[PDB]
Homo-oligomer: A and B are copies of this chain.
């Protein structure tokens, strides 16, 4: 049995290789790179930026003082005023660099009127400070706000099922929202993933074949409050048209389900994903209800969410047979 293109948790199961021009591409797309790495690397990357700027200006300030001879008389006196009060060592230069760029500015170490190069540096570093701060806030806010994380509160059922609804034979998976905050402009997709050879003898290692779930009358758009059971009507235009309970129980393919919507707070699109191998599809089954009424409101019991119950009355032939007979 051929292994799965996307895992049940939604993760895609492909490795890329021989992209060999990538680090220049990742550099040109640096932000996308940057917000996708691990917090700890993004953070210490920003830490390096601070250290580097702090050392650099510390060093410049130290030079200025070393050369102005302030290391000898740091506090000044009548008839000698240093560039920056109280920079005596390099530690004291670095302290001043930190205190200025952070804008902590304790004051013991302090710029003077004397050297306009000392002043110019405090000006440059103030601006450099803002710049870096700004990159950081931006990076952190972006990373913080990533809507992929919202998929963790959207749930696909563990199994698909096939079964009859209103005279038609249908593939059915279920989706639900685990928060009271909505999924705006929510809509849904599906695809059949098997390899195939064309009549022109072309080999497609994994062709993706649409699994119509209502796009053409906008019935793929959903208003997901309580769980919805999605329906693919298996008919002449479906790629399960001629697939019967028998075929399925020996067949080798994958169904990929996608729910896309906007996280309500940020209106940023999330993409939730899951998958169903042929072997995870329960022919002749139906989902137990979760929605039931109460005096004032309805309620959804999420225990039953994944649970199916068998409908032995269900045809076992393909939907094609089922028409080529009737």
Contacts and interface: CB of A to CB of B under 8 A. Distances in A.
A235 interface: no
Interface string A138-158: 111111111111101100000
Most buried by B among A16, A205, A296: A16
A126 B105 CA distance: 12
Contacts of A50: 123, 126-127
A326 interface: no
A182 interface: yes
Given A32-B181, A189-B221, A296 B200 contact: no
Nearest to A218: B215
Interface in A1-60: 2-3, 5-6, 12-20, 22, 25-26, 28-32, 35-36, 43, 46-47, 50-51, 54
Contact of A17 (B258, B267, B300): B300
A167 B199 contact: yes
Interface string A200-239: 1011011010101001111111110110100000000000
A71 to B, nearest CB: 12
B189 A35 contact: no
A3 B141 contact: no
Given A14-B226, A103-B104, A265 B36 contact: yes
Interface stretch (A62-70, A84-92, A245-253, A317-325): A84-92
B260 A271 contact: no
A256 B223 contact: yes
A38 to B, nearest CB: 13
Contact of A205 (B51, B202, B210, B289): B289
A119 B220 CA distance: 59
17 contacts: A6-B225, A16-B180, A18-B302, A31-B144, A46-B127, A51-B123, A91-B113, A92-B113, A103-B103, A104-B126, A134-B141, A166-B198, A182-B271, A203-B289, A205-B289, A210-B218, A264-B271
A133 B141 CA distance: 10
Nearest to A263: B32
Given A95-B111, A137-B141, A141-B141, A3 B297 contact: yes
A278 interface: no
A292 B105 contact: no
A266 interface: yes
A138 to B, nearest CB: 4
Contacts of A266: 35, 142, 145-146, 267-268
Contact of A137 (B51, B134, B262): B134
Contacts of A122: 98
B29 A206 contact: no
Contacts of A113: 88-89, 91-92, 95
Given A141-B141, A145-B266, A166-B199, 7 more contacts: A20-B303, A43-B131, A95-B111, A95-B119, A106-B106, A185-B269, A205-B298
